[PDB]
Structure 1
Amino acid sequence: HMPANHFGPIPGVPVGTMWRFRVQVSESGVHRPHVAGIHGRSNDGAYSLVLAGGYEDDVDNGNYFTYTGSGGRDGQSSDQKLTNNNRALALNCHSPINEKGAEAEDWRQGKPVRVVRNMKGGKHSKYAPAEGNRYDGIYKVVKYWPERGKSGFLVWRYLLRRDDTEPEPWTREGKDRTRQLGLTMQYPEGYLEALANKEKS
């Protein structure tokens, strides 16, 4: 199958693919966590992440976007620490990891990060799909740093620039590779009838 600490693209899953649920995304091996937004080890790096909404500063510009770390409680109580996934995402960036933040002198060498976009990010991003989840290729960490929210507590911000050959599925060439490849929304088996039987009664 596909090792869990596997960085990079999943063979058999092209960009522009769309599963209706997160469970399907995990099943596919593109983002294992059934609910969490990022997957990775403190000692290895981040393998994948999905976009929901959260922070209001998080700008999604398509080819690049910024992300916010997690933790700070157990509701903001303590300023986030560079441990766990916060740290793991920090490794994908190609520079010696540092407490005050860091910017890669050459971001392209950093470890790849599979990025999926959920439709819950529609309000904010004009790139999030209408419904479900869509795989938009590889993004590498360019730089990360720590800000201080309106809650006076530091939070870890990151900037991801795309870097996958295959064209963004929201562009002309993208929407083309899709058709050629015939990619369509995917529902779990038995889901559509289950959904049907809901509406009835």
Structure 2
Amino acid sequence: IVPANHFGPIPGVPVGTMWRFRVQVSESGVHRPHVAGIHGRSNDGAYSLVLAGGYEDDVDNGNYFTYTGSGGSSDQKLTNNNRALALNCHSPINEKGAEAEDWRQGKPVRVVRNMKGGKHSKYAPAEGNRYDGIYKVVKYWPERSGFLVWRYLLRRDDTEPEPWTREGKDRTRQLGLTMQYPEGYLEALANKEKSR
């Protein structure tokens, strides 16, 4: 595997792989937190995040999406994962939001989409978790719920194509990527011979 604070793609998991649970996504190293949306250290940056349709805003447009941080029922602070993510934007950490001088020079963020994101996004998978590639932070800002939240614009910068495109649907088919289940999960669950 690779270090936890490692930035960028995990070697061997191309764009379009599909795990069923987030523990498989973790063991794969693509997104190490079992539950948390963001993986980051406030002193370094954010290494990976998940879109599971948590926030009633957070508009998902494929190559572009808005995203909201962690905290709170009370105001969100620019600390921990919130601060970690903003560190990737090619701009000095500003406590009032910043924009990127050449956004493509930001730290890379791994991004996977989850079936629960379908509540708000046409780009979610029908099932499980799909690593949709690399994004960079272009902008971040605070806004009002009725409380203050920290939000982020993310643009995609990966060489391999989005899995929902024609080119990407061919990469998913040619590389033979199928929904990967935990060893034993399918076989074990098929046994519903309880009492009746």
Q: Same fold (TM over 0.5)?
A: yes
Q: Which ranges of 4 or more aligned residues in structure 1 deviate by more than 4 Å?
A: none
Which stretches in structure 1 are left out of the alignment for 5+ residues?
none
Secondary structure of the corresponding residue to residue 25 of structure 1 = helix
Rounded to whole Å, the distance in 2 between the matches of 1:199 and 1:66 is 45
Change in Cα spacing, 1:153 to 1:13, as seen in structure 2 (3 Å) is same
How far is the alpha carbon of 1:78 from its aligned partner? 2.2
Aligned to 2:180: 186
How far is the alpha carbon of 1:153 from its aligned partner? 1.8
Rounded to whole Å, the distance in 2 between the matches of 1:132 and 1:174 is 18
Secondary structure of the corresponding residue to residue 70 of structure 1 = coil
Q: Deviations over 1:129-187 (max 9, x none)?
A: 00000000000000000001xx4321001010000000001101101112111111100
% same residue: 99
Rounded to whole Å, the distance in 2 between the matches of 1:188 and 1:198 is 18
How far is the alpha carbon of 1:38 from its aligned partner? 0.9
How far is the alpha carbon of 1:71 from its aligned partner? 0.6
How far is the alpha carbon of 1:200 from its aligned partner? 6.3
Question: Is 1:175 equivalent to 2:169 in the alignment?
Answer: yes
Rounded to whole Å, the distance in 1 between the matches of 2:182 and 2:194 is 20
| TM-score, length of structure 2 as denominator length | 0.96
| TM-score, length of structure 1 as denominator length | 0.94
How far is the alpha carbon of 1:198 from its aligned partner? 3.0
Secondary structure of the corresponding residue to residue 134 of structure 2 = strand
Q: Cα RMSD over matched residues?
A: 1.1
Counterpart of 2:146 (choices 146, 152, 162) is: 152
Rounded to whole Å, the distance in 2 between the matches of 1:63 and 1:116 is 13
Which stretches in structure 2 are left out of the alignment for 5+ residues?
none
Secondary structure of the corresponding residue to residue 176 of structure 1 = helix
Residues 133-142 or 188-197, more deviating: 188-197
